[PDB]
A paper describes a structure:
Bacterial cells use several evolutionarily-distinct genome segregation systems, the most common of which is the type I Par system. It consists of an adapter protein, ParB, that binds to the DNA cargo via interaction with the parS DNA sequence; and an [name], [name], that binds nonspecific DNA and mediates cargo transport. Each chromosome encodes its own segregation complex, with Chr1 encoding a chromosomal type Ib system, and Chr2 encoding a plasmid-like type Ia system. In this study, we have reported the structure of the [name] protein, in three states: apo, nucleotide-bound (ADP) and in a filamentous complex with nucleotide and DNA.
The purified protein crystallized readily, and the obtained crystals diffracted to ~2.5 Å. The obtained [name] crystal structure includes one [name] molecule per asymmetric unit. One of the symmetry-related pairs is consistent with a biological dimer, and largely resembles the P7 [name] dimer structure. This suggests that we have obtained the structure of the [name] dimer through crystallographic symmetry. Overall, this structure confirms the common architecture of [name] proteins, and is consistent with the fact that the [name] chromosome 2 is plasmid-like, as suggested previously, since the [name] structure confirms that it belongs to the type Ia family.
Author numbering:
A (entry chain A), B (entry chain A): 4 to 119, 124 to 182, 188 to 368, 376 to 406
C-alpha cells in the first residue's frame, strides 16, 4: 500500500497544516518575568571594578539629577542592573566596545555545543553580561529546537504589542530583512541591559527536512551559508560577542552554525558517556568543516570545559585528570561542581545569578572564574581573528 | 586560516581517535540488576487469565516436579516472572505465537517517535511483555543515541563473558552477520523472559555524519534500507512485535527506522509545544516517506497517544479535547496522567511495573488500558499487514 499511505500522509499534511500555533500567545503564556537580585554596593563594587568612592560619587551625581534609589529594610543601597549600568556611564567608564583600541573589532562567534541541562552557555552569557566595567554587548542564540533557552532569560516580551517572533531558522528560511528589522522583531531584550536573546521553536525542525532534501537537488554546500548570510552578518554591527547554542546532533542546523562560527566551545562532564560521544565527535569532526565553501574562515580557538564536577569521588577525578593530562591546556581549570544550586536552576529555569551560603558563591565563583578564564582566551585571539 | 584549522582538526581526529571507550565496562558499571516484584496469585490471576483452580493445578504440577516456590512472611505465594511463564506452559496454554492461526504472521514493526521522559515505548514493551496469557516475543530497540533506554531494563549482562555489545547502527555500518550472530551478541535478555533489548550508544551519532556525506556521492536513497536489510529482517524470525524508538529529530537514523517500519506511534502531551512540533512534523511528514525506494511497504496504521495528563486543569482539557474533537479516533482514550509515580520512574530509571496506593494502580491501570487499547488495533491490522 505504498501509495495509499502517502496519500493519507499528505491528507494529514494539508489537513493539519492549517490548525493552530499562536506563538506570541505561548511566549506570553510563559512570562516568568521576574527580575534580578539587586546588588549591595559591595557586590556592585565587585562586579564593577569601582572604588566605593568613585561609585558613591557616581550615585551622588545620579541623585543630584532626578534619580531615586530604592532602599533596604536596613536603609542600605539596593542597586538594580539598570542602575548599575547607568552608574557606570555616570562614573565615566566606557563600554568594552567603547575603548576604541577595540572598536573596529569583529565579533566573537562562539558556537557552544552541548553534548547531552543544556544550560552552560546561558551561565556564560550572564557572567559575561554581568561584568559592568566592560559591559559587553552579547547575544545568546538558541538553535536547538528542543531548547528551553528562552524560559531561562525570558525576553522582555514588551507586550502582545509584538508583531511576530522569529527564530534563527525563521530568518534562514524566512518569515525585507535588515538590521533595523532584526532589532525590532527577532532579537529581544532580557533583564541584562546588554544581553539580547534569539529563541528557537521546535518548528525550527523543518530546517533539517529541507536540508536533507535540498541536497537531492544538489551535492552543493550552499546550505551552510544561510545563517551567516541571512542573519549573523546582519547583526554583527550591534554585538561584541555572539553565542550559538546547538546541543547534540549532527545537523545542517549545527552545520549552519559552524560555518558562520569562528570559535568552538564544547561543554562536557567527567562522565565517560559524554566524554565518549565527544571523541567520536572530534573523529567525525574534521570533514565536518572541510565541507563548507572554502571561504570558511577557519576556527580561531576551540576548547572544552568540565561541567558538573564531583571533587569528592575519587572516581570522577579518575576521568578529569585523564582529561587534564590527556589535554592539559585547551581544557579549563574551572571545574564547575555538581551543586544543589546549579540543579535547582535547571528545576526553576533560572541561572545561579537569579537567586538569593552553600552553593551560592561557589556556584557563581565557579562560573565567574570559568568566565574570567574563558575571558582571557577571547582577548588572546581577538587580534588574529580581527584580521 | 581555513586550511590550518582543518589540519588541527584531523590532528585531533586521529590524535584522539585512539584514546578509549570500554563499552562492556560501562554497561557493567551500570548494572542496576535488580528484578521484578513477585506476583500475588491474585495478580498472577489478573495478568494470566487463569482461574485460581487452573493456576493452582499448574503450581501443583510444578511442585510435584522438583520446583520450590518462594514464600511470604505470611506464607503466601510469591511468584516470579519466570515462575509465571513456566506456570503458563504448565497450564498448557500456548504463547501468542503458538496459536498457529497466527504463526505464519509477520512481525509488527512499530516505530515510536518521542517528540520531546522518552519512556513510553518502554512502558508499552513492559505491559505487552507482562501479559502472560499471550506472552509476546517483543523487542525494544533504542535508536536515539541520547537514550537511557537500557538503563531502564538493564539487559542481563550475563557477564564480562560477553565479547562485545553492538547497537542498531553498529549493525547498519557494522562491527559475518546472521540471526545466530545477532542473538548471541546484540540482543540481550531483560528481566521479562520474553522482552529482549537492543541498546544505542551516543557513538551511534556517526551514522548521520556518514549519511549526510554519503549523499554527496549520491542523491541515491539506499541509505534508508540499511537497518531493515542489515538487522530487522535478520531478526524478524524470533519476534512477534518490534518497537523502534527514535525521539525527536529529522534523521537518516529515524529515516532508516521509518523505511523498515510498518506502523507509527507518536507519543505527545496536552502541551501546545509538543503538539505544535508534531503538526509541523506531519506537515513535513509525507515527502518524508515518499523518498525511500518505492519498495516501501507503506504504513498500516499510525496513531498518537496522550502522555502526562492533568485531568484537573481545565486548561489541559482545553487542548486534549481540541485533540479529541480534532482527531477523534486515531488518538487514544487512555490519557496517562502526570503521576508522582511515573515521574519517579524517570528519576530512578524504572517503569511503574518495577516498584511496590496513590499512583500504583492508576499508573499501571493507565498504561495497562493504554496497552489493551493499543492491543486491539494491532490485531485489527495484523491481517492486512500480513499480506
Amino acid at each position: 500500500k505504498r501509495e495509499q499511505t502517502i496519500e493519507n500522509l499528505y491528507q494529514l499534511a494539508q489537513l493539519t497544516q492549517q490548525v493552530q500555533a499562536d506563538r506570541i500567545e505561548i511566549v506570553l503564556e510563559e512570562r516568568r518575568d521576574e527580575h534580578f537580585p539587586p546588588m549591595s554596593k559591595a557586590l556592585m563594587e565587585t562586579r564593577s571594578g569601582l572604588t566605593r568612592r568613585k561609585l558613591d560619587e557616581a550615585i551622588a551625581k545620579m541623585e543630584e539629577a532626578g534619580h531615586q534609589f530604592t532602599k533596604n529594610n536596613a536603609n542600605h543601597y539596593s542597586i538594580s542592573l539598570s542602575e548599575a549600568h547607568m552608574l557606570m556611564d555616570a562614573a565615566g567608564v566606557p563600554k568594552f566596545h567603547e575603548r576604541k583600541k577595540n572598536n573596529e573589532n569583529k565579533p566573537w562567534i562562539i558556537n557552544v555545543q552541548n553534548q547531552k541541562k543544556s544550560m552552560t552557555a546561558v551561565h556564560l552569557a550572564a557572567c559575561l553580561a554581568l561584568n559592568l566595567d566592560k559591559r559587553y554587548r552579547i547575544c545568546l542564540i538558541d538553535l536547538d529546537p528542543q531548547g528551553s533557552l528562552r524560559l531561562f532569560l525570558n525576553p522582555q516580551i514588551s507586550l502582545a504589542e509584538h508583531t511576530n517572533i522569529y527564530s534563527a531558522v525563521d530568518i534562514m528560511l524566512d518569515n525585507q530583512v535588515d538590521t533595523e528589522f532584526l532589532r525590532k522583531n527577532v532579537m529581544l531584550p532580557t533583564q541584562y541591559p546588554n544581553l539580547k536573546t534569539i529563541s528557537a521553536f521546535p518548528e525550527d525542525a523543518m530546517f533539517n527536512a529541507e536540508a536533507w532534501q535540498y541536497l537531492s537537488q544538489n551535492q552543493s554546500l550552499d546550505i551552510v551559508r544561510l545563517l551567516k548570510e541571512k542573519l549573523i552578518d546582519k547583526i554583527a554591527s550591534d554585538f561584541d560577542i555572539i553565542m550559538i547554542d546547538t546541543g547534540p546532533h549532527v545537523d545542517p542546523l549545527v552545520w549552519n552554525a559552524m560555518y558562520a562560527s569562528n570559535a568552538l566551545l564544547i561543554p562536557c562532564a567527567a562522565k565517560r558517556l559524554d566524554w565518549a560521544s565527544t571523541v567520536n565527535f572530534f573523529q567525525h569532526l574534521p570533514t565536518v568543516y572541510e565541507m563548507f565553501p572554502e571561504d570558511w574562515k577557519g576556527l580561531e580557538f576551540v576548547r572544552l570545559m568540565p561541567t558538573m564536577f564531583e571533587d569528592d569521588n575519587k572516581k570522577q577525578v579518575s576521568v578529569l585528570t585523564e582529561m587534564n593530562y590527556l589535554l592539559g591546556d585547551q581544557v579549563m581549570m574551572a571545574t564547575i561542581p555538581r551543586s544543589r544550586a546549579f540543579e535547582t536552576c535547571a528545576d526553576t529555569y533560572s541561572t545561579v545569578f537569579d537567586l538569593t551560603k552553600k552553593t551560592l558563591a561557589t556556584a557563581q565563583d565557579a562560573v565567574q572564574k570559568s568566565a574570567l578564564e574563558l575571558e582571557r582566551v577571547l582577548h588572546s585571539h581577538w587580534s588574529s581573528l580581527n584580521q
